[PDB]
């Protein structure tokens, strides 16, 4: 569906990030230079940006 | 030729923000050799898309 | 569908500032292999939280 | 000598934003050796294009 | 209702002071060999201490 | 001698934007050894040239 | 408990004068590292000079 | 090589122009194998050319 | 420790030393197989230019 | 205990802009060993010097 997020919906997604509920996909080494995809928790720097945006709203 | 309109810009930003998009990056396959693969758009990029959608 | 209220933003920033949070990172385990682990949030990120708390 | 006009700039940013453009990068093929290859334009760059498109 | 902790203005300054006075550490990954790492704590860096000092100067 | 004037600036940015230019980069040839080679101008740099062309 | 303006300037001065150190990781071979102290960098000392000049 | 020369306005723009037109190079370190490096010259990068162009447009 | 505060004039004298190429900074230098030693190197151009920028504004 | 005069700032900036200055860097000589060497000041730094001279 063609969807445009409205203001409250932006804040709901930002809230999930801030609360530590989201992950992101990165490459992880598995030996000798080979890598696999994996998910990690979203980093503090990103959570803080989400909080900073929430606090401005 | 296509110029994306203001609403079209917000729709693409939304796809990104909602985690529906990928980007192509290089992944190690061993001994320095790499291959092209797709990964999810990173949180930092999603947060940028959210930030712009909040300014809409 | 939660939206963090003003107080709740500051409470979260406080947890970070006070050194109570961690972040998940990749740590080398030899010859290119890595494992996920948690490390304390960095001083740079804590100081940003402190700066935000000082403005509030 | 050509100068890209207003509408032309937006046409080019649109191709980028839509995921239709590539860039040439260096990819490993083993033991330090690299080859030139094309990859999709990254999400960060698409986001910049979408931002510029949204502000015109 | 349980009122969770929000750091107060004086307390932000007290934490920044600890940092600026060189009394704080952060956890980093340190190399131990062959691509392997271990966790250790290091003194907060001069760059971070200067950011703290700057914020203290303005407060 | 030559000072580029405003239109000449826009002509050069136009070449960059249209993907007609290259830059010289160091490419790996094995075991740390490198060679000077040329690759297309990157999307980030093309987008900067587009941004500048749109502001004119 | 809280550094006041003058103590801030004293601390920035120490840094600007090249009297301060910071802890960093130094290689000791084969990927291993040890913690050591190094003089605070020129970039940092210049930031401190900049803040001192605006005092 | 006069050590006390000061560039005039038009000489600044002449120098930026040489950069923009791809006439200049910079000295960088290039790998020659097993960690050994040599000094070499490369063309000025597109990023630096674009900054020179931007400056010329701001004149 | 022996406390001191730099005055406006001392700020400029120390920037001038940097800008004139008279100062050094400590860095780590490789000595082989990943091992490093401390060494002193001249202050970099980028840092001398920032000093010159500040001196120019004063 | 010199303080650079305004003209002396510009003279120094001019040396850099004209390609006459060098900076000291570390250069690999093999197996991880490095040596101090001098290289020309980079284009990015020459361009900054140019920008500052242009504002004078």
From Swiss-Prot, chains E, H:
Record region (Oligomerization): 1-59
Transmembrane segments: none
Domain of life assignment: Viruses
Protein family according to the UniProt entry: Belongs to the SPP1-like small terminase family.
Job of this protein: The terminase small subunit specifically recognizes the non-adjacent pacL and pacR packaging subsites and regulates the ATPase activity of the terminase large subunit. The terminase lies at a unique vertex of the procapsid and is composed of two subunits, a small terminase subunit involved in viral DNA recognition (packaging 'pac' sequence), and a large terminase subunit possessing endonucleolytic and ATPase activities. Both terminase subunits heterooligomerize and are docked on the portal protein to form the packaging machine.
Subunit structure: Homononamer. Interacts with the terminase large subunit gp2; the active complex is probably composed of a one monomer of gp2 and two or more nonamers of gp1.
Record's comment describing the protein's domains: The N-terminus contains a helix-turn-helix (HTH) doamin that is involved in viral DNA binding.
Name this polypeptide is given: Terminase small subunit
From-to range in the entire protein, with total length: 62 to 120 of 145
From Swiss-Prot, chain G:
Residue segments, region Oligomerization: 1-55
Molecular function GO labels: DNA binding; identical protein binding
Record GO biological process: chromosome organization
Domain of life of the source: Viruses
Keywords tagged on the record: DNA-binding, Viral genome packaging, Viral release from host cell
Function, as annotated: The terminase small subunit specifically recognizes the non-adjacent pacL and pacR packaging subsites and regulates the ATPase activity of the terminase large subunit. The terminase lies at a unique vertex of the procapsid and is composed of two subunits, a small terminase subunit involved in viral DNA recognition (packaging 'pac' sequence), and a large terminase subunit possessing endonucleolytic and ATPase activities. Both terminase subunits heterooligomerize and are docked on the portal protein to form the packaging machine.
Record's comment describing the protein's domains: The N-terminus contains a helix-turn-helix (HTH) doamin that is involved in viral DNA binding.
Family that this chain belongs to: Belongs to the SPP1-like small terminase family.
Subunit structure: Homononamer. Interacts with the terminase large subunit gp2; the active complex is probably composed of a one monomer of gp2 and two or more nonamers of gp1.
The protein's name: Terminase small subunit
Organism: Bacillus phage SF6 (Bacteriophage SF6)
Gene of this entry: 1
Residues of the full protein shown: 66 to 120 of 145
